[model samples]
Structures are given as C-alpha cells and as structure tokens.
Target: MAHMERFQKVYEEVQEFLLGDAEKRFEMDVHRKGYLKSMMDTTCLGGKYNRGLCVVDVAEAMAKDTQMDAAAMERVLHDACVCGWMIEMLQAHFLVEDDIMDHSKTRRGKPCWYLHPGVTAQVAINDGLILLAWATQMALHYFADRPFLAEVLRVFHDVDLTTWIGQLYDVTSMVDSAKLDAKVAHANTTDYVEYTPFNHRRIVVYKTAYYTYWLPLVMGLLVSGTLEKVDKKATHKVAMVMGEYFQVQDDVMDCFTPPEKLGKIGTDIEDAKCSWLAVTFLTTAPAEKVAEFKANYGSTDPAAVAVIKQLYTEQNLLARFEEYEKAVVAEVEQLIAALEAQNAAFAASVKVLWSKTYKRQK
Candidate 1:
C-alpha cells in the first residue's frame, strides 16, 4: 500500500512500485494452510514483465484526456493497476499450465512448479487454475463499481478463451519426441516445409500475442473507459503481427542463442517444435536432406543438439529474421499512425509497444 500512493503520483514508476506492492500482498497469506502460501510464492516469481508495465504507461498517457479531471484520473489509475495485475496473473496461469502439459523440466532457473518434491502434477494443475480465479477475483474486487465493468470482464474473457484456442493448436503441432528408430521418428515427424507462416501466425495471435502483447494495452483503454477513443480491432491486428514476430525471435533464440541467455534448454529443437526456425529450415532443405533432418530433429533431450542448430545457422535464417522484422515494423507503423491520429495523447504510448518488442533479448 505504501507504493500505491507513489503509483498514484506517476505511472512510469509502476514496475518498481506496484510490483513491490504485489510481492508483499502475494505471499502474505501465511494463515492459509496447505500449499497455498508456498505455491503462490514460487508460481508468480518469473517474467520479463514488459506486458504488465506497458499497461501503466498506456493508461497514464490516456489520463491526459482533458475530459478526465484529477479525481477521475486517480480512479482510472487504480483500475489500470488492477487490470494490469490480472493480465500478469493470467499469463502466469497459462505458463504454469502450459509447462505441465508440455513436460517442461525447468522455468526461470528453478525446477518447474510441478516438479518440486511433495508436489503432485495434479496439484500443480489446480494451482494454475487458482491463478485464473485469483485474477478474476481482483477484477471483481477492484473494478466492480466502474460503469464499464461488464466490458472489462468481457475483454478478459475473450482474451483468455482465444489464448486457450491457440494452445490447442500449439501443443498438437509441437512434439515432445523421445529417441526412436529414425524411421519411426520420420513417420511421426511433421513436414515443416509446407507449414506456412500464415498458419503459425494464427497460433501466435491467439496463444501468445493477444494475451502477452495486446491485452495489457486493450485493458488499459477499458480502464480509462476510452474504448471509443481507440480503433480496437485495428490495434489488435497490429498486435497480432507483433506477437508472431516475437515468437519468431524466440524460435531463433531457442536454437541459435546461447544457453545462459535462454534460462532453459532450447527444447524447441529437442521437441521438434513447428517453430519459425523449423519452417525456415525445411523450406529450403535439399531433397536428399529430408531423412537426415527427421533423424536428427525431435529428441527428448539436447543430445546431438548442435548438429541441427549449426545447419539452420549456416543457412542464414538470421537474414530472413531481419527481413521479417523490417516488414512487420512497416506494417505496424501505419497502424500506429492511424491510432495516433485518433488519440494524439496516446501516440507516445503506442511507440512504447514497439520498443518493448523490437530486438528483445530473452
């Protein structure tokens, strides 16, 4: 609560101020028995938080609306923070659940939450659900009295549902391949050549892009009750591209980037993920190389890992990655121009979104 007043003074301070506030409120339920306290402590521990803090910047800039006096702006900032936290909570909810289903060994430098001793996989699943419930609870507690409460909840529901739909596609396409006779693995292996960028683009939008990149911005507008002020659909379309690009960069990192920066094994290579790298690799692979590609790709561990990584690296996918980045920036810059035309006050905020995503490390 000490930091809440500071955030009331300025939105840019939220990453330092509100996160500290949240950490205090988060693990303080000592009275709760069972795994509640310990589970929560570890669950929300890791994130880059570009998404959550972006909400504050967007909302504060929108508060420059002359229609909103000081009182109205204060209320908006409070709702902005709550909604931002809800977005953060929802992200954590997805990551925990996704890691469990994906059979992930580690996240953010610790054993995955489900892997810690005395923790059953079933309990870990329930805890992920609990994070969702807690996010909804915050919405009910903080924004209930706002006139646009229904709309706020509506956006939240839509984002969550869309993310789930994306996950359905992602898991089906990504393989957690165990070592196999090359022939058996080859039969199971998906041909990454025909997997179009447009296809992965859909999954990126629904699964990672909307919830990760767009929801924070959209939710901030909803908090300001400035829904009518922005071009919601067009803005989302921009995020849709931005989100896919972000994943594209992540795919490159999974194979090309060093392990220390990655914070986990580059499982995308081991799992035979239908990643941007995978699609790019197969698109130009020689006719004689297909069998070898399947033979080496998709093991459960990073065994013989460098073999495939070296192949993609030498093929010069980084040049293609650079091209992809250039194209999306041109595309989104138009959308940002249109959005800024509609809300001059938010022009700077829209620019902030690109800075967060561009050439991001880790």
Candidate 2:
C-alpha cells in the first residue's frame, strides 16, 4: 500500500515532465495542448500499475546491498521510477491499439479512448504512436548521462519488438473472418483452429508474459546495476513462467468475472483469443463438446457468445482453473528457490511480485 503512493507520485512526475514538453511543443495550438492533456488523463491513469511498480520495487531490492550514501541512493531510486513509468507508457500505447484491433468498447471501466465522443480512429492511432515514442524519450531523457543508458535503451527496443511478435502470434492464432463467415452454422466440427498447449504457451509468453513480467524485472535489474551480478538467463526463466501463470489467470477472469468487478467486459470468447480456458476445454472435452464450442466461438452474435460461456460453466472450468493455479504457484516457488541460490535479493524481489499476481482479481 505504501509503495503504491510512490507509484502514484511517479505518474504525477511523468505528466509533469512529458506534458510540460508537450505544452512547449504545441505552444501556438491551444486545442492540441488541451487534447494532449486530456489524452494522457484518459488513456494512462486508471489501471493497476503492476508492471510499472515492479520495476521500481525490484531495483530497490537489488540495490540494497550496494554501498551508497543517502543522496546517491535517492538518485538511484528516482531513475528506477523513470524506468517504471517508461514501461507504463509502453503499456498505454499497446492497450490503445489493442482496443481498436479487438473492437473493444470499454477499458479500465470507461469507454475506449477511440470511442471518446470527439475522438476518431485517426486521433487514437496517432496518440497511441505518441505514447510509444514517449516511452523511448523518457528513458533517453532521464538516463542521458548514465553509463547504463545503452543497455536500458536496448531492453526497451528489444522488448518492444518481442511484444509486437507476441501480439502477432495472438491475433493470427484466432479463427479468421473468412473461416467464420464461410462455414455453415453448426455444420463443420473443425471450423475453428484447435489451440494446443504449444500454441497457447507460445502466445502467452511472447505476447503477455515478456512485456508484462520480463520487461519490468529486467528493467529493474538493469537500473540497479545488478545485471552483471545476477544470472540473466535464470532470472528471465522465472519471469517467463510467472508471466504464463499470470496470463492464464487473466483468461479465466475474462470468462468468469463480471465486467463491473473486472473493470471491462470479457471479449476473449468473441475475439477467439488463444485463451487458456479455451485450450484447456478443447484439450480435455469430448469431441461433441469441442464441436459445440467451435461453432459458437469467434462470433459477435449474443446467442453464440452466451452459448460459449454456458459451455464453460457447464464443464466446470473454474474448478479446473483453481487446480491449475495451485500447480503453477508451486512450480514458480521451486523456480524462485533455485534462483535464490544464484542471487538471493533478486529472487526475493521476484517472489514479492509473484505474490501480487497469485490471486489478483484485476
């Protein structure tokens, strides 16, 4: 709870810094200035800052053993906050585009930025691009003179590419429009692509896990000057596994949790995402049930959507998800324990993050 205050402060600082720049850049255009301010407020501020905060928390933990004065430590922590917000900005950019791609209506309990009364698709697209550029600018502006600037930039660039590939995997894994429209209703049993563990795991790691978990933890490692001391491969292994666990929970929540409670309505079923729930059900259910699921999935029809959800409930997917959750937690614990032997502080920081995601509802 206390750390969340610092996280909030970082958001304030980010606006002060970036918005200040925007004001000067658009000094002659009052409308643009106001639009920029509104855009930041609308798209960036509402969600849980889990990824951003993890960056700062990990840096703080890893820097504990390094010898530094109070003044020097404060400087280090400030840089960590900058890195954290960089991740947040990247997330905002991705989210805005994702909403458009998925035809999402609401986000963070409000209308998608693209759906705001005065905003057009073009406005949203450019605004989303601005966020992406700002992520890079923030890192460069804050770490201009630091020795680790190159590495910091590298991670941001690398993760950006990886996240794009993951999104590609996610979208392509779904049933295409032609496949859906060309099929006769309830006639084809193999109409939808049957997602397997291999495909599901790949999408989860590349799309959600790397950016959500790996980027933040690796950012912390780089900023804390612990990259050399810690084993990068092992640390990433832990983060990737944790990410898979985290995303599975997300897939579950999309179907089982209500929009009022979860902040946005679940559309994974409609979008035909390579969701964990779908994969689990397809793999385990009888052929007749899988055929029933395939027919209703990838559709905008309310009745079809309802049928898919009802199938999940009838199959008792929630109970199976609970069991899967426990298994992943145990597996992550063992992974973290192994990491402890290499770098206990880094392991401990990762463990704290793991706890946060364990049973998160939003």
- Predicted structure with the largest lDDT when compared to the true one: 2
Summarize candidate 1's per-residue lDDT along 277-310 as a digit string, tens digits: 7777677767665556667887654555667776
Off by over 4 Å in 2: 25-28, 176-190
Lowest summed lDDT over 10 consecutive residues: which window, candidate 2?
182-191
Candidate 1: stretches off by over 4 Å? 1-34, 174-187, 190-194, 301-303
Which residue pairs does candidate 2 place in steric collision? none
TM-score for each model = 0.85, 0.93
The alpha-carbon lDDT assigned to residue 252 of candidate 2 equals 90
Cα-based lDDT at residue 320, candidate 2: 89
Model 2 residue-pair collision total = 0
Pairs with steric clashes in candidate 1: none
CA lDDT of each prediction against the hidden true structure:
0.72, 0.84
